[PDB]
Amino acid sequence: TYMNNTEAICDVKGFAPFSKDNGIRIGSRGHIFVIREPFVSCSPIECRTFFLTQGSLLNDKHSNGTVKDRSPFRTLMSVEVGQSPNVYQARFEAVAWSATACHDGKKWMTVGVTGPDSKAVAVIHYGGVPTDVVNSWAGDILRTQESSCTCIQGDCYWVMTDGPANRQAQYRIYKANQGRIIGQADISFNGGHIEECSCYPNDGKVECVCRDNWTGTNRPVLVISPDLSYRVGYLCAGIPSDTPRGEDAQFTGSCTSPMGNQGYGVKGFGFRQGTDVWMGRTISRTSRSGFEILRIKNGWTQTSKEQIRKQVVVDNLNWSGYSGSFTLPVELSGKDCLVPCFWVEMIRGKPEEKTIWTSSSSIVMCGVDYEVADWSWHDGAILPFDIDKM
Amino acid sequence: TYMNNTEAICDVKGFAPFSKDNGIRIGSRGHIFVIREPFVSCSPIECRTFFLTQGSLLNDKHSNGTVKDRSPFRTLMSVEVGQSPNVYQARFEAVAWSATACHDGKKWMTVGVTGPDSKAVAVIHYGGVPTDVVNSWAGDILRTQESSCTCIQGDCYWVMTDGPANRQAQYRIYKANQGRIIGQADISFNGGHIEECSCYPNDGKVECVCRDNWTGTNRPVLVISPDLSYRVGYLCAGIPSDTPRGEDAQFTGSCTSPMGNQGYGVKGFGFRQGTDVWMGRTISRTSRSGFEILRIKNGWTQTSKEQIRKQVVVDNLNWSGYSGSFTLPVELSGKDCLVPCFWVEMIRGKPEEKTIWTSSSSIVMCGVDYEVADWSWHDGAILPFDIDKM
Amino acid sequence: TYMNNTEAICDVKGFAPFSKDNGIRIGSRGHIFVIREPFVSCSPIECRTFFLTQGSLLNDKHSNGTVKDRSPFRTLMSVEVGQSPNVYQARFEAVAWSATACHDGKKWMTVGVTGPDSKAVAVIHYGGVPTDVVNSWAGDILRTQESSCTCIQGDCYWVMTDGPANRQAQYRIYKANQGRIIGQADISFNGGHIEECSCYPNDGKVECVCRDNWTGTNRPVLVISPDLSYRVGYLCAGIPSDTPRGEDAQFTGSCTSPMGNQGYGVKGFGFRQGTDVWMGRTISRTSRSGFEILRIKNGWTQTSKEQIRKQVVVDNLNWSGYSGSFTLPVELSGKDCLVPCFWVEMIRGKPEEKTIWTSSSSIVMCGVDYEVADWSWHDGAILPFDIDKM
Amino acid sequence: TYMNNTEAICDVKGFAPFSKDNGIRIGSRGHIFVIREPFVSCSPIECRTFFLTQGSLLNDKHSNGTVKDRSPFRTLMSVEVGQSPNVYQARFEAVAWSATACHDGKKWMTVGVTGPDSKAVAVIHYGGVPTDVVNSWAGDILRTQESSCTCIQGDCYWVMTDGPANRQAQYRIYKANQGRIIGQADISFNGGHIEECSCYPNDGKVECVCRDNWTGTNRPVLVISPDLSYRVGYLCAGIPSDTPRGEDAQFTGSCTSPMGNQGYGVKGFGFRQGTDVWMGRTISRTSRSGFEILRIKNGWTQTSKEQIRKQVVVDNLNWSGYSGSFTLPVELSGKDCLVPCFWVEMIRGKPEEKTIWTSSSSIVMCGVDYEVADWSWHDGAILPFDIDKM
Ligand SMILES: CCC(CC)O[C@@H]1CC(C(=O)O)=C[C@]2(SC(=N)NC2=O)[C@H]1NC(C)=O
Ligand SMILES: CCC(CC)O[C@@H]1CC(C(=O)O)=C[C@]2(SC(=N)NC2=O)[C@H]1NC(C)=O
Ligand SMILES: CCC(CC)O[C@@H]1CC(C(=O)O)=C[C@]2(SC(=N)NC2=O)[C@H]1NC(C)=O
Ligand SMILES: CCC(CC)O[C@@H]1CC(C(=O)O)=C[C@]2(SC(=N)NC2=O)[C@H]1NC(C)=O
Ligand SMILES: [Ca+2]
Ligand SMILES: [Ca+2]
Ligand SMILES: [Ca+2]
Ligand SMILES: [Ca+2]
């Protein structure tokens, strides 16, 4: 049976902890994959953690993490959420140095992108087998969400980018059923930049909060209809939520265009709440460190600077990283709305820490009807590791 | 289908061994979690061992167990009873430095408490996802059973405490269906102290034997009706069963109030048997060492000092620890009553042993219609470990 | 649905390899249990390997195998046949320093015996939970098959012994349904000695070939009817098949009493074939080394010395050990008879080899309609191990 | 339900990556089997990787790979495709130093060959148990596909060879249902040599592209009908695809007989495409290094030298090895044709590399409707390993 996923997102006053994997602490002695970009998507049965593998293990020489991001050894695999990305619980997903995953109620559909930068190929798996393909259409590092895709009434949608990572690139919306491409669309967005979208279903559409890696310290926003007509622009909120970025005092909002005039960025997320928004961001303005989530009254529709809530999940003395969105399917939560949730990646190792490798663990939070106290569920592993003195 | 769990507990003459996990012996070379407080609860299919994880492994530096009990790295996970708490068989349950778990016949409901001491949050999972929340209502280390909760006809009940660990605190009874809170109650118990309840179903109610960590060397007792009306007080039996405590000769019973005038304590259990009781306790009066279980004729209802049975499962030359109760569901045992069972935790390491860490394994016993010979199924691992000489 | 298991055993011309686990070779670097006495029993779905665990791992100090056979750390666990007894595939079965297992078509019933030598307790599990108990009735190391038990039309039967291991002891037949004891019987066998029976179903009865550890170099034989009436005596065949034993030339057969006038022994097996028998035995007359299986025309019913077939599975330059019987259930083989099969244990370490430990792996063979060439599927691990130089 | 597998193979313009296991990289620190000859076959649910095990682990002394190919320790086991051949995900299949596997829609049928060179035995498993046997009929290393067998409407077929590996040998076609042999056939092929067939279903027959290890640098081809009538000969294409072999310029095609006049060879594959063929081959003419796949217009039926496509999956600076064919079952792909796919083995260690061992990993590719860019998904592990300096 297909998941409807046509409900509204739940109005939430705060976030409760779902899971923490302790991959890197466990990785001190256990067999764990070196990873970046874990992420959660949920079937009507379970939410799993997907992750990019470097073909290697923590505390092993192959954890030489100075051997490429887009290496030919990168695979997407997955475990049940909370479990660590260890070999022996891992289920294989796709060859991918960039991926997205989601479930339509019957099976899982993943998308793996591998191949060379000049002509990358994206394989679409469904039910555990390749079913369709998307080639690079712009010749420059084809890529996608690095977070959960979205399924509504049997059709799944996701966002892909092909082009420069720091200038005008090209941005596309693909749509598929049972692992088969059935519609696509170009996104007209000149001056704007779209990367690594975090999407979710809301009111029978797909809402996406992504990353401007060109000139925007605010976040591009995408709203996709089943017919692949769309609205796109920036999260109206008068508070910047990318990293890096400047102070809140020095920033003015926009619905239409990028603000802050800064490059780089980090993958992040946001949740519409009527006209309000929950926006995650690192505590540091300059470092992938700390993590907080702010509610902004009318942040979805106005240049609002009205902060009505604020919750911390990673204190600023600790390393953060990527963040993305997913929903609790109705069939699991038992709600009449879509429970909004997020994961936060915690990167350890290079560049900031003095070791030969780089990996990450995660914690997962989920929207509740209550204000939840600030705390820090940081990664916690002690650096450097054994092979760090080799 | 919901488990009725409205039957009476079986009258038992003794206890037979269910399982022993050998986690720590196995942990010498295998990948095992550092743990405290394992415990058993059973679905209509299997009984699992739940446990608190320190985010770390035996024989690894992160087993630095001088890094907090209520650390942000503590998760509840579970394996099938008898299996060891190893990474690769572990199923993730909740973020929790204190937990309880139980099954209602359809799914598992766990409760994880994490967050800071001043404002702890308890997440209630059901079917593998967060469904409801309980915040700290008294600002002081919110906490609960550390043993199996109880389900009757679809509604699950458990006991929580918020307050001082060595003085008057506050004590609450929560009740839930399908992971959703549907009723709660304050327990009026002035002069008394309730901690870490071991409960079970009996005659369609929840009977709880808990821990007085204030002034009681006898055990507080709680009897909960579906409507959350209750009786509470102390196990009548004229024999003390907490640790520490004084000699039996020097002790007088009470139904109403604490006796022995001593602080501290250890989590323990007891089983009503008509008017009699089976009470577990450490053999030592002063040490978490040895473990025995006594039947006291009319110990549930009178100040009786009539010891009619006595069985040993851990001899006094060996380390014990926590103990708790659960029942064999009818659907598994094939009985017309509820088979009473217990687990016993066996703590190795600090404080008593000379190492850098502390963990534990368990053995599980189950009520039978026969007198069963005394023996010792002690932990058995050899201390210190490799990383102990580091 | 209950397995009928009322068919006849297949007439077989030889034996084909089912599985080999390589536990000890794999145990050089992997996490494997130290074990003795693996054995196979089959459900309508899978045949598993059961085994006794020492609570410890190969290549670890706890593999100090100078720490008792009947230690309080011994558990029965199981994996799918062919897999090695590693921690992470292991399913927990019972606390047991001696065990038996079998399936009735709906669930598994195991029997674990633990407790002290003077008053041992046998726990009977069914569906993963304790259901009934047998206490020591003779005060002297209560024990049983160390091989698969037998189920016919829902009732399972097995053989137990309580008494001296080298003189007249007592021998009992228990019978159970759904994990509940429903009939028992004493075996009158004066001058005879019964140990470690290898049984199977044949023509709607249970046939058992066991071990005389008193004075017999031939094997005691037991035929059990559903009503627990029985015949017992010795395998008629005029060839001895225990270890140790003397030469074949120097031996005369018996149906009634023990022959060879030698003590000790080793667990072994045999399969009726009309009036003939397949009998396994070590190649050495004095060592648990090599392994062969002989067909003796009319060996089941006469003092025959007519060797009509001979097949080798372990050459004499290699170590053998225990052997036992089981059948392929009809539901798996697709035959109209019961396919006879056996496992052979391969003991490495003390006493014969120079190491600090003792474990074993197995190979499994199964009766076919063809003559199968001799070979040696020996254990193959290289002794001593790492911890052997410690 | 039986898989029809009577459809035509899909016309494909290129190949997309299915999976890569990284076994050897992972094997640096994890517990992985030493293997040769992995291969894929698919059930209606999953495609698994089968592999030959040396009874040992990477980075362990038993990885002494100077201890025989046809050792008594070799077992076939399997994991889900993409997963690595690690112990803890491994499912046991058969005792085999040469194997084939396939699924008929209800269960798996494997075939293990073990025993001595002079009289080898092949065991046929079905549903996890031995069901039938094939003895050596020519006394000289009985053997088979080392790749997926084929099932059509419930009957499975595969090819076996018994005889000299470098001269005229004997070649047989076996056919079975539910694990039971129901028809066989001798292949008349004088002057020709058949080894290690890679087969698939196509138009309701079994097409096989195999290996001439006698005098052929082109590949023998076999087309089998349900009645075991057959055509056999050589892949017509005017381009040689074995290793070793000479230059393409120096080669003339044949449908009937071997060409190139060279010995040795390597297991390979090919896919009919109407009258065209996709043929895999190593890039090197003399080394098991690099890997490419060529489409030859009318290569199936004519001496064509018309190269219309060319795709690289392993660049020539890297080691390749065996390759074989399988199909995506309709029930998984959702196509109306049979999706053609292949795996490529990547051998590391002896003979070419300076270590004490030899193993391999794989990548899996699958036919798509699009031209897919060349790349190299090579093995990637760094040689030598730890035990390499021992
Ligand atoms: C601008 C975003 C993309 C574009 C290549 O780059 C990702 C940046 C990045 C980071 O930590 O910031 C990690 C990466 S690495 C990777 N495998 N996935 C990522 O998201 C970069 N993405 C790719 C496809 O290489
Ligand atoms: C008085 C009981 C509680 C109250 C905090 O303290 C537990 C004591 C204790 C022990 O071994 O005795 C172990 C602890 S540590 C833990 N994670 N669980 C426990 O039961 C303490 N409980 C908490 C929530 O910290
Ligand atoms: C005479 C057979 C029994 C009687 C105690 O002794 C077993 C002998 C033995 C061996 O290798 O020969 C191994 C033992 S050790 C064990 N756990 N299982 C065995 O079969 C012995 N049995 C017991 C219950 O200790
Ligand atoms: C000529 C092909 C066969 C005939 C024995 O030999 C195989 C050659 C070979 C290789 O790498 O080329 C690997 C082997 S080793 C093995 N276990 N499987 C193989 O395919 C050889 N086959 C056998 C049954 O020994
Ligand atoms: Ca930016
Ligand atoms: Ca106390
Ligand atoms: Ca004897
Ligand atoms: Ca050749």
CA distance D37 to D222: 21
Probe ligand 3: pick from C39, C69, C162, max atoms within 8 Å of CB? C69
Binding region of A: 36, 70, 195-196, 211-212, 216, 242, 288
Which residues, other chains included, contact D340 with Cβ-Cβ below 8 Å and sequence gap of 6+? D9, D10, D12, D200, D271, D278, D325, D327, D366, D367
- For B231, phi and psi rounded to 5 degrees? -120, 150
Partners of C100 in the β-ladder: C111
Out of D69, D117, D369, D386, pick the active-site residue: D69
- Give B26 Cα–ligand 7 centroid separation in angstroms: 35
Residue B246, burial from CB neighbour count under 10 angstroms (0-12, 13-18, 19+): middle
CA dist D233 to B27, B245, D166, D186, D247, Å?
A: 59, 90, 18, 14, 22
Measured at the CA of B62, the angle between CA B58 and CA B63, to 5 degrees, comes to 40
Domains of chain B, by residue range, sit at 1-390
Contact C55 B377 (CB under 8 A): no
Q: Which atom of ligand 3 is nearest to the CA of C347?
A: 11
> What Rg do the C-alpha atoms of chain C give, in angstroms?
19
CA distance A194 to A220: 7
- Give C217 Cα–ligand 7 centroid separation in angstroms: 5
Residue B331 carries which DSSP code? H
Interstrand relation of B230-234 and B220-224 (parallel, antiparallel or unpaired): antiparallel
CA distance B218 to C275: 69
Give me the DSSP letters along A195-210. Answer: EEEEEEEETTEEEEEE
- Give A258 Cα–ligand 1 centroid separation in angstroms: 20
The answer on whether B353 is annotated among ligand-binding residues is no
CA distance B250 to B242: 14
* Best CA proximity match to D95, nearest among A301, C274, C18, C385: C18
CA distance B34 to B85: 8
Confirm if A142 and A122 have CB atoms less than 8 A apart: yes
Q: How was this structure determined?
A: X-ray
- Give B259 Cα–ligand 6 centroid separation in angstroms: 9
Residue D276 carries which DSSP code? E
Closest ligand (CA of B217):
6
Interstrand relation of D170-177 and D180-186 (parallel, antiparallel or unpaired): antiparallel
Residue with tokens 């909120």: A237
Tokens of D162: 């018994």
Q: Return the amino acid letter for B345.
A: E
Residue with tokens 């047991």: C96
- Give C261 Cα–ligand 3 centroid separation in angstroms: 21
- For D348, phi and psi rounded to 5 degrees? -115, 155
CA dist C338 to C235, C367, D108, Å?
A: 21, 10, 22
Q: Which CATH code of 1.20.58.340, 1.10.287.610, 2.130.10.10, 2.120.10.10 fits the domain covering A1-390?
A: 2.120.10.10
Confirm if B243 and B265 have CB atoms less than 8 A apart: yes
- Largest Cα–Cα distance of chain B, in whole Å? 56
Residue A345, burial from CB neighbour count under 10 angstroms (0-12, 13-18, 19+): buried
Tell me which residue in B46, B83, B376 faces C90 most closely, judged by beta carbons. B83
The verdict on the CB of residue C309 being under 6 Å from ligand 3 is no
Q: Which helix or strand (DSSP H or E) is residue A332 part of?
A: helix A330-333
State the distance between the two ends of chain C, measured CA to CA, in whole angstroms: 53
Q: Return the amino acid letter for A104.
A: D
CA distance B64 to C269: 52
Tokens of B335: 């009985």
Residue A32 carries which DSSP code? B
State the distance between the two ends of chain D, measured CA to CA, in whole angstroms: 53
Q: Which helix or strand (DSSP H or E) is residue D91 part of?
A: strand D91-95
Residue A11 carries which DSSP code? P
Q: Which atom of ligand 1 is nearest to the CA of A52?
A: 17
The answer on whether D288 is annotated among ligand-binding residues is yes
CA distance A296 to D350: 63
CA dist C165 to B289, C161, C213, C325, Å?
A: 35, 9, 6, 22
CA distance A291 to A279: 11
Instruction: Spell out which chain A residues touch chain B, with contact meaning CB-CB distance below 8 angstroms.
Output: 16-22, 25-26, 28-31, 42, 45-47, 80-84, 86, 88-89, 328, 332-334, 363, 366, 368-378, 380-382
CA distance B174 to B160: 7
Binding region of A for Ca(2+): 212, 216, 242
Interstrand relation of A91-95 and A75-80 (parallel, antiparallel or unpaired): antiparallel
CA distance B197 to B186: 15
What residues of chain D lie within 8 A of the CB of C31, using their CB?
Answer: 31
The verdict on the CB of residue C352 being under 6 Å from ligand 3 is no
Give the three-class secondary structure for B286.
Answer: coil
Contact B130 A368 (CB under 8 A): yes
CA distance B264 to B248: 18
Q: Which helix or strand (DSSP H or E) is residue A15 part of?
A: strand A14-20
- Largest Cα–Cα distance of chain C, in whole Å? 56
CA distance A131 to A137: 19
CA distance C39 to C342: 9
Contact C133 B18 (CB under 8 A): no
* Best CA proximity match to C262, nearest among C240, C277, C283, C279: C240
CA atoms within 13 A on the CB side of C48: 22
Q: Give residue B178's region: left, alpha or beta (phi > 0; psi -120 to 50).
A: left
- For B330, phi and psi rounded to 5 degrees? -50, -40
Tokens of B134: 């309980």
CA atoms within 13 A on the CB side of C127: 19
* Best CA proximity match to C264, nearest among C288, C280, C248: C288
Tell me which residue in D31, D93, D135 faces C29 most closely, judged by beta carbons. D31
Give me the DSSP letters along B183-239. Answer: EEEE---SS---EEEEEEEETTEEEEEEE--SSBSS-EEEEE-TTS-EEEEE---SS
For the stretch A125-158, what's the b/e string if a residue is b when 16 or more beta carbons lie within 10 angstroms of its beta carbon?
A: bbbbbbbbbbbbbeebbbbbbbbbbbbbebbbbb
CA distance B162 to B139: 7
Closest ligand (CA of D165):
4
The answer on whether B36 is annotated among ligand-binding residues is yes
Contact C95 B20 (CB under 8 A): yes
Interstrand relation of B121-126 and D276-281 (parallel, antiparallel or unpaired): unpaired
Give the three-class secondary structure for B258.
Answer: coil
Give me the DSSP letters along A352-382. Answer: TSSSS-EEEEEEEEEEESS----------PP
Find the length of chain A.
Answer: 390
Resolution of this model in Å is 2.7
Contact B112 A81 (CB under 8 A): no
The verdict on the CB of residue B242 being under 6 Å from ligand 2 is no
* Best CA proximity match to B99, nearest among B204, B196, B33: B196
Which residues, other chains included, contact B351 with Cβ-Cβ below 8 Å and sequence gap of 6+? B358
Tokens of A210: 């992504």
CA distance D363 to D367: 14
- Give A217 Cα–ligand 7 centroid separation in angstroms: 84
State the CB neighbour count (10 A cutoff) for residue C261.
Answer: 9
* Best CA proximity match to A212, nearest among A165, A250, A149, A279: A165
Confirm if C326 and C306 have CB atoms less than 8 A apart: no
CA distance C280 to C341: 11
CA distance C218 to C211: 8
Q: Which helix or strand (DSSP H or E) is residue B180 part of?
A: strand B180-186
What residues of chain A lie within 8 A of the CB of D29, using their CB?
Answer: 31, 57, 59-60, 62
Confirm if D323 and D198 have CB atoms less than 8 A apart: yes
CA distance C289 to C347: 9
Strand order in the sheet with D276-281: D270-273, D276-281, D289-296, D307-319
Q: Return the amino acid letter for C49.
A: T
CA distance C202 to D276: 58
Tokens of C261: 């006038």
CA distance D4 to D7: 8
Report which protein residue has its CA nearest ligand 3's atom 22.
Answer: C98
Report which protein residue has its CA nearest ligand 2's atom 1.
Answer: B165
Q: Give residue A72's region: left, alpha or beta (phi > 0; psi -120 to 50).
A: alpha
Q: Count C/D contacts: CB-CB distance under 8 Å.
A: 127
What are the residue numbers of the active site of A? 69, 322
CA distance C198 to C113: 17
Out of B171, B200, B230, B322, pick the active-site residue: B322
Tokens of C121: 């307790």
Report which protein residue has its CA nearest ligand 3's atom 3.
Answer: C165
Binding region of C: 36, 70, 195-196, 211-212, 216, 242, 288
- Per residue, the 3-state secondary structure of chain C, as one string, reads CCCCCCCCECCCCEEEEEEECCHHHHCCCCCEEEEEEEEEEECCCCEEEEEEEEEEECCCHHHCCCCCCCCCCCEEEEEEECECCECCCCEEEEECCEEEEEECCCCEEEEEEECCCCCCEEEEEECCEEEEEEECCCCCCCEECCCECEEECCEEEEEEEECCCCCCCEEEEEEEECCEEEEEEECCCCCCCCEEEEEEEECCEEEEEEECCCCECCCEEEEECCCCCEEEEECCCCCCCCCCCCCCCCCCCCCCCCCECCCCCCCCCEEEECCEEEEEECCCCCCCEEEEEEEECCCCCCCCCCEEEEEEEEEEEEECCCEEEEEECHHHHCCCCEEEEEEEEEEEECCCCCCCCEEEEEEEEEEECCCCCCCCCCCCCCCCCHHHCC
What residues of chain D lie within 8 A of the CB of A121, using their CB?
Answer: 16-17, 372-373
The verdict on the CB of residue B32 being under 6 Å from ligand 2 is no
Residue D352, burial from CB neighbour count under 10 angstroms (0-12, 13-18, 19+): middle
Confirm if B72 and B114 have CB atoms less than 8 A apart: yes
- For B51, phi and psi rounded to 5 degrees? -165, 155
Give me the DSSP letters along B1-43. Answer: ------SPBPP-SEEEEEEE--HHHHTTTS-BEEEEEEEEEE-
Confirm if D243 and D214 have CB atoms less than 8 A apart: no
Find the length of chain C.
Answer: 390
Tokens of D114: 């073990």
* Best CA proximity match to D108, nearest among D45, D188, D27: D45
Dihedral angle sign, alpha carbons of residues C61, C67, C73, C74: positive
What residues of chain D lie within 8 A of the CB of C340, using their CB?
Answer: none
Q: Count A/B contacts: CB-CB distance under 8 Å.
A: 127
Measured at the CA of D96, the angle between CA D94 and CA D99, to 5 degrees, comes to 90
CA distance C286 to B205: 64
* Best CA proximity match to C282, nearest among C264, C299, C303: C264
The verdict on the CB of residue B143 being under 6 Å from ligand 2 is yes
Q: Return the amino acid letter for B18.
A: F
Residue A62 carries which DSSP code? G
CA atoms within 13 A on the CB side of A189: 28
Tokens of D119: 């009289």
What residues of chain B lie within 8 A of the CB of C28, using their CB?
Answer: none
CA distance B377 to B356: 25
